[PDB]
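Annual report, structural modelling task.

Input specification for the magnesium ion complex:
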Amino acid sequence: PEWYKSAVFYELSVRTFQDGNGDGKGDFPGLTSRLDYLKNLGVDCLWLLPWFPSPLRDDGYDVADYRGIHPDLGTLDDFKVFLREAHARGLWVIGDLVTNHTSSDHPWFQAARRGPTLPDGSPNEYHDYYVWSDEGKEYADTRIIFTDTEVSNWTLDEQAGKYYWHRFFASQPDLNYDNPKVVEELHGAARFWLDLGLDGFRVDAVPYLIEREGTSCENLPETHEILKGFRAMVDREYPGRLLLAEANQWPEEVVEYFGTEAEPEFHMCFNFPVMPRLYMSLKREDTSSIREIMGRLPKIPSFGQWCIFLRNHDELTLEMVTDDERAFMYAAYAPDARMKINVGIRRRLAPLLDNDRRRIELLNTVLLALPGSPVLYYGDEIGMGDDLGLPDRNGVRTPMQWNAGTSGGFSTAQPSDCFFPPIQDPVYGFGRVNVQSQLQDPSSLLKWTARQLELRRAHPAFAHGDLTFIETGNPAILAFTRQYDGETLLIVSNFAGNAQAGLLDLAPFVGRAPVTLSGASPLPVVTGNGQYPVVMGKYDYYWLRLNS
Amino acid sequence: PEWYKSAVFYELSVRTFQDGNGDGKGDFPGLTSRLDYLKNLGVDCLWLLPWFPSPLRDDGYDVADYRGIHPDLGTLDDFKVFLREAHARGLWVIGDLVTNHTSSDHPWFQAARRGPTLPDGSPNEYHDYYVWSDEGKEYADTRIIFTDTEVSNWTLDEQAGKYYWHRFFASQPDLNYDNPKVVEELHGAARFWLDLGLDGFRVDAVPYLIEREGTSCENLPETHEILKGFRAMVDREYPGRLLLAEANQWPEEVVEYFGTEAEPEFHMCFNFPVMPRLYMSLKREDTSSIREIMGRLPKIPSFGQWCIFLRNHDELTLEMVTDDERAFMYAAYAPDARMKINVGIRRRLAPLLDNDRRRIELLNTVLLALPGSPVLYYGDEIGMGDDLGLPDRNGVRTPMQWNAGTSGGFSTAQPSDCFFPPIQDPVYGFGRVNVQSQLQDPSSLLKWTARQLELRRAHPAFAHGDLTFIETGNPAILAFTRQYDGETLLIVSNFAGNAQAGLLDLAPFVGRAPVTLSGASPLPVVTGNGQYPVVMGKYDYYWLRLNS
Amino acid sequence: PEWYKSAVFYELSVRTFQDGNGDGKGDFPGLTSRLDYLKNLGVDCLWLLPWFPSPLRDDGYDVADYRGIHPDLGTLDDFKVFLREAHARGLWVIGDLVTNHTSSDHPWFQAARRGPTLPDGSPNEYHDYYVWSDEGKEYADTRIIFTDTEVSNWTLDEQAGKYYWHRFFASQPDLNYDNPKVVEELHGAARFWLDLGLDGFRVDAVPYLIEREGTSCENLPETHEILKGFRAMVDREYPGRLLLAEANQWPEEVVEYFGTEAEPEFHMCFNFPVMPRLYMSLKREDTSSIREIMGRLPKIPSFGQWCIFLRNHDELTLEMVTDDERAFMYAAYAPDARMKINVGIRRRLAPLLDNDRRRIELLNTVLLALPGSPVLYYGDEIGMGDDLGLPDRNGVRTPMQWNAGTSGGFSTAQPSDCFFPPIQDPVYGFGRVNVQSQLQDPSSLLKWTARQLELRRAHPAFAHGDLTFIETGNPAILAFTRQYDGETLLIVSNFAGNAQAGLLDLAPFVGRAPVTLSGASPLPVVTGNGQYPVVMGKYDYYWLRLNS
Ligand SMILES: OCC1=C[C@H](N[C@H]2C[C@H](CO)[C@@H](O)[C@H](O)[C@H]2O)[C@H](O)[C@@H](O)[C@@H]1O
Ligand SMILES: OCC1=C[C@H](N[C@H]2C[C@H](CO)[C@@H](O)[C@H](O)[C@H]2O)[C@H](O)[C@@H](O)[C@@H]1O
Ligand SMILES: OCC1=C[C@H](N[C@H]2C[C@H](CO)[C@@H](O)[C@H](O)[C@H]2O)[C@H](O)[C@@H](O)[C@@H]1O
Ligand SMILES: [Ca+2]
Ligand SMILES: [Ca+2]
Ligand SMILES: [Ca+2]
Ligand SMILES: [Mg+2]
Ligand SMILES: [Mg+2]
Ligand SMILES: [Mg+2]
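The model returned the following structure:
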């Protein structure tokens, strides 16, 4: 199969990973010096947060120049060396393609805001790069994403004397995909990096490209059409590259972003629908929603692969759960108002689970066992915390924690001069949570992650198999099979914090012996009616094979 | 009107309030020395927990003798002084009538377990006192109440070689109320205490008296009949005395336990329907469930009053809430499995609200301003915590905390020798939480409670007026009026942790000023459409009078 | 800008914070061991009370060696370790420079008092260090500061047979700043500590340096000139250090102590004029004094920052308020004779506000929201009380209360062996009020204070913004805006104990939507003419931003 189908992805932010020169900002040289770490961990493809020139009002997702390297990060030369050394070690690298909008500081908007027509009466060709309105009445009753900050998706520009559209911050005016010069402007952005050897893109905020009156301005067919065309371009000019979609929508609409066999869109999309149901189930001690929401995902094209994930650099999003499910999530996972933002909970994986390794390991094993390619968020493999004193979603973007030295090993700059402060609290600060500690610790979470990815490489059914759920007679116990190329894996997992009993419907497997993938230790042979009694300890995960 | 309509109740346990003599067990001489404190708090009626002789397998709710005083608590003489001194201070006292069942140790059951006929052939009249079955397949698919202890509501008696019935523990066999001799053993048990001057009874577990095949064995019309004859008795032989029912059922089944004007039952029932919705609304910042369960309550007889309460000696009960309501409450209010028992949450009021006085005060103001008569659980007026290392529901029955001396002022005996250990943790311990502390502190929870009761007493609409909810334009803001004898109170309460805006429908009251009950500070008069704009700070409660 | 404009200051006393060796006295080893506490609280600069050798007749403000460490506190090595550990955590430190006077035990004064001419007939260079009069009739009609102790500002030295000047205790003779050798001795004291890395100085009693006949001997131009020279010396030889002035004068004279842009003096002064008016307004429930006094303060130099404080190690000074205001304050806050001392009230914050956390929280938020940098008095963040059985102002200097073990955690010596006895009363004693308790209490005053500072960090308009008072129609409601960097904060505060309504004049902000800084909950958009109705609870603080 395709290479993204067997990849382990790792999300990181250059500005925040490793500082080479002491100025308190992460840079490409520093990242380059930590590629062995990543490769040794089991990671195949790096996804880098936006690295472009930017005023950084949205941490670099407000892009001022698509064909360069933000000075904080080094030079285009440093980037090219980084990418040569990543491929040297057999890693792929994808970047973040911000397509729905640019920074207000981008030259195109600096131009667009001079008005429709130029001092000499000739049309301003850049005015139609963005979306203007005289009074801002259009696209009413359209959802506001950054609700804690924006009262409107229209904002009046003082120089233009008109309103411009923005699905995100006001300093992030939306591009106009009804204008064909904009479609080409970002094909050209794509070519610039694909040409240098980048292996693909995470494509950002794709559901919000085209706005149409009388609709939600999400998932519009006019939007999908642009993505089909973006895929046809890459498919022709750069075979083998990866287009990955950030499309947090409900199951029926998400699968649309893969396109069809006849008309392909994305190769992979994040599985936003299952993510919140993992957390809900852990609290409810009941994995129904996991099974229900996955069952609502229609089959995807041949070339398609899901990207599975526990957390990332944004909040834990509650946009696409029901109202009762959202209320449950704030109650169970955000007991401080400060942990809420913009319809989601802005916390890291370990804090979200009360720093309980049994529960952390549990969800990571579901992450590695569900059908897709997993993506780890940087620092989650050592158990990093968060700093909710930082604004917006930056509390989960604090410096990587490398050792107990100055600034957690992130920089020789003082923690007060680092672009964000390395966490220093008594539970998750870098005197306790760092890579150097966990490399010497024989039983560290980091060592555990490495070992678990290793276990998964051994069994291609994780990467490529189907998924069939198994009845257990106990909602605390989720059980399913993964079949691929002759091998059958049984995954049994307890989402309860005490011992749980189950009776597994192993009818199709009578006469087979389940045996542990780790240590090749066999269980009683399935007999009789195949209803198989099991007991599990708290947050237990059973990775088993069903014999030939 | 009736005295229980204007009364403030207060629930305590003699074994646990005050130890007079130094042996570690609270007693009636000790309780007697604290009547002045209770008088000064603003309390009118003491409800005592079961004081009868007993092996204490359900803390005295397993009664071995309905006509005595448990030796722990002193003697029947000590009882008589206590009731003289309480009455001398204008206090009413009601006992706990454990009707549905007795202790296995009661001399009734020791006789009934010797078989249907005696060793000399004659028939054993005590056998039909309890409910029996040879195989114990009757009344199946009936709910277990103590789901964490009892596997079945039938248990084999080894000597009588049959099964007996028990809705509660196996040492608490149900009484057979088909047998009219049992109805008369409890009438005469009631008569014993009423003859001594006791002002009433709280009656225990009244839904579960009669059991019949093909029914749930709850609120059976037969059970109600027995209650009707109990009130008919008391109305005749002891006018003015009080019958109060513990009936945890859904709004439509609970009002039945009042009877009708023509056929009366209880004077008072505990308003269980609203109790869990108070907590949900605080966590959801959504006061909707309060208005809906209050709305499902049908009007009650003329003589009837609700008994409003936040907590008691039992768990917070999750039996009469939906499955999603129950699952939400576990998430929001029971982070540990230890905190759970028997479809409920075994935690004191202050721990339930994270010791946030602003929240504690809010639920109290709602407790004091809903229609009915409030009952305070002992020690919640100084903010006692709990001890969840103690079995069953004992963790909310730890000794009262009077001062910072030996065992919190409860006993001269060591904490290890007290019947329950006085709490000594750094947050709720008697070094931090005690009555001497809060009589000196000008602003303690204790003095706040005494003053809020003082303020309530000044406005009889609180105890007898009607309830009209009011539209606020914000699920977080609960607003209602109370109307009685020409007074109109307006009770606005924020259930959200941040500031909240609201538009109150004061259309009926255009032209009238609202003014504070405390301080006589008037707000702007209501005008025009009477949509009254209001802002509220976190957890704010506005007690206001609408001028005339 | 400069670091002290963003700093949160914290005032502590080494002898009283933490004893690191069991001898009952705080020391620098002990204070070093508590630095993570201050860091995690959100403190940036530690103002340490006088740490010099001294007989402690005024608790170390009678200095006897400006270049050493009082043996109670440890050695100069201990001081160096403390400064290294403070800076290693991003904490600045400043000392208390006692410029106006030395101890009578100071070597200089033991020398000066020998007479103008030594036994060998040669002159005594140290006689002219202090201020001498032959009959003590100069500067008559000049205020006595320590009115409860000192009957005159001239006292007869037994040995010199002349009169020496002292604005303070007779054991604190005033230094004579007309002698330029004196001026050099305190530039030299400054240099010593400024050379070890200390970040600056709180400068004690700076109005009273120079005395002149026919004046008040306050705020004289000759005193300001010496202070300009002190600023010049630091500006040149130690750039970036902080000079903070203690000048309790009337609003006009206070501002002089900043100097001018051309001839600079102090970087910061305490905002003494506003401090009493905060208390006046809380008792009157009328905030006009807060506005009248704030508005008599002229604009300050570019480098100027105000230091805001509620209480400190002194008495609550009533020196700079009218006779009627002072009589009110005595009536409202000094019921017992014992509570007055020298034109002022000697009580801690929490006793002053009757331990009402609502009122403690209100004034703390005004402290954090007025223009300036805030300074917290140690132990006030946990609600410490006072011991008015101690003499002078020591009642507010009792040891920090850390846990509920021996002496409250301050020392392993018994309370009766501690320099001052740690409080043990039922309301404020370390058994009820201590750090460890309040770290476990999910709702403690300590956590509140930490979180409120974090709220403040997030909005630079608090440190840096301007201030426009806003009409409300209700004197009980104090409303103002803070504008900086185009972020606009609206801060509304109720100073009364019941609900209050008002009409905010928000005309400059029509079309803006106010949202809570905590939670982002929106109030209605300002419409119409910006007359915005609000209702507030008792002692409510609305902390709002005006979303643009
Ligand atoms: O709807 C799902 C999401 C999409 C959005 N995430 C992406 C789009 C935004 C584009 O500027 C950006 O802030 C964010 O980091 C990106 O990863 C949003 O900001 C998230 O908070 C949210 O969970
Ligand atoms: O359904 C309401 C309830 C009734 C039951 N409460 C009473 C019945 C039990 C009788 O022995 C007794 O333990 C309990 O204290 C009484 O107040 C039960 O134990 C509670 O858990 C529960 O909230
Ligand atoms: O007028 C303001 C004040 C200054 C003075 N405070 C300082 C000067 C004194 C110098 O010896 C000292 O006692 C006090 O602690 C210092 O902080 C005075 O003692 C206070 O009572 C008073 O509030
Ligand atoms: Ca768009
Ligand atoms: Ca029964
Ligand atoms: Ca002087
Ligand atoms: Mg760098
Ligand atoms: Mg006793
Ligand atoms: Mg010491």
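Residues B 100, 174, 208-209, 211 surround calcium ion (ligand 5) (CB under 6 Å).
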